Symmetry: C3
Amino acid sequence: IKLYPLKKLEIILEGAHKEFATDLLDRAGVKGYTIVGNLSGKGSHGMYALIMIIAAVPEELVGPLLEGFQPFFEAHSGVVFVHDIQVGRPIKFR
Amino acid sequence: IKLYPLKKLEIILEGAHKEFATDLLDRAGVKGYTIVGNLSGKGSHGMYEALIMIIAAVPEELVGPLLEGFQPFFEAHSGVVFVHDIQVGRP
Amino acid sequence: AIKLYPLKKLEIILEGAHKEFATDLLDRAGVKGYTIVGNLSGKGSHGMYEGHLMFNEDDALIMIIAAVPEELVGPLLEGFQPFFEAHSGVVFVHDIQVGRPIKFR
Ligand SMILES: Nc1ncnc2c1ncn2[C@@H]1O[C@H](COP(=O)(O)O)[C@@H](O)[C@H]1O
Ligand SMILES: Nc1ncnc2c1ncn2[C@@H]1O[C@H](COP(=O)(O)O)[C@@H](O)[C@H]1O
Ligand SMILES: Nc1ncnc2c1ncn2[C@@H]1O[C@H](COP(=O)(O)O)[C@@H](O)[C@H]1O
Ligand SMILES: [Cl-]
């Protein structure tokens, strides 16, 4: 048929660390991302400028990408949600 | 890194009830949530051009108790709940 | 206690000027509701889209979220394909669960 599997990350972190995260995605070969701005939240270290970066990636990049974010996330607020998704043309993503 | 299974709720409802919702999350033991504002949308009850969406990763055991706590509210107020399967990293 | 049923959830990301095109497609197919996240930014094959820089707010990127029965995913993607051959954007299909199928089907 017509659908092909991919992975989708939801990366939630402080707005001030946007450049870090996008440069990390770019580096890794991720071909695109979408940024939801002006979010609020609650977590360990209190409540809430938070943003959410959405990135559709081939499964081959999840491992590498989480390794990249781990060091950041040991010293900073935030989280990464990995989702399974399907797309009609995975071309655009690899 | 090791990947572990979790559930992710997306809870869309009128911002006037944000407090009710976050409180409910807090008392059920939800360790965190993220909120998206200034939303617009279409539902059985017409157009919205406000709305908010609450994102909450939680362990599977919490989903059932959470839906039951929201049931009274959603059987008398606009809004929807979407349950996703997600994975999260743990090193 | 609350039973859960499968659906699909689409995330459709495109420039705000085409919002009516995309929602019309949803209405036509029988989609019963949708939620729109506005004022987004993004990097794409074409370049960068920065919501905050647009003079008309309605022109910025948006993301339409639509929970739909799996039967409507084909008819919808067939409609969005030619649009996305000619215009910026992407569609992500998710599996989700909901407690009230009647609200969506
Ligand atoms: N379980 C969760 N669900 C949704 N968002 C979360 C969750 N945990 C953390 N976040 C987001 O990440 C931010 C920081 O969390 P923390 O790293 O725990 O301080 C929170 O303010 C939320 O916006
Ligand atoms: N199928 C759907 N997909 C995404 N969002 C929805 C859907 N149905 C309802 N919503 C959201 O929930 C709000 C309230 O809808 P309702 O509960 O039908 O009045 C709408 O304005 C939308 O933002
Ligand atoms: N891999 C991806 N993950 C998340 N969002 C994307 C991705 N590729 C493209 N987008 C979004 O789609 C917009 C247009 O993409 P394009 O059609 O390649 O210009 C971008 O500005 C992003 O907001
Ligand atoms: Cl619902």
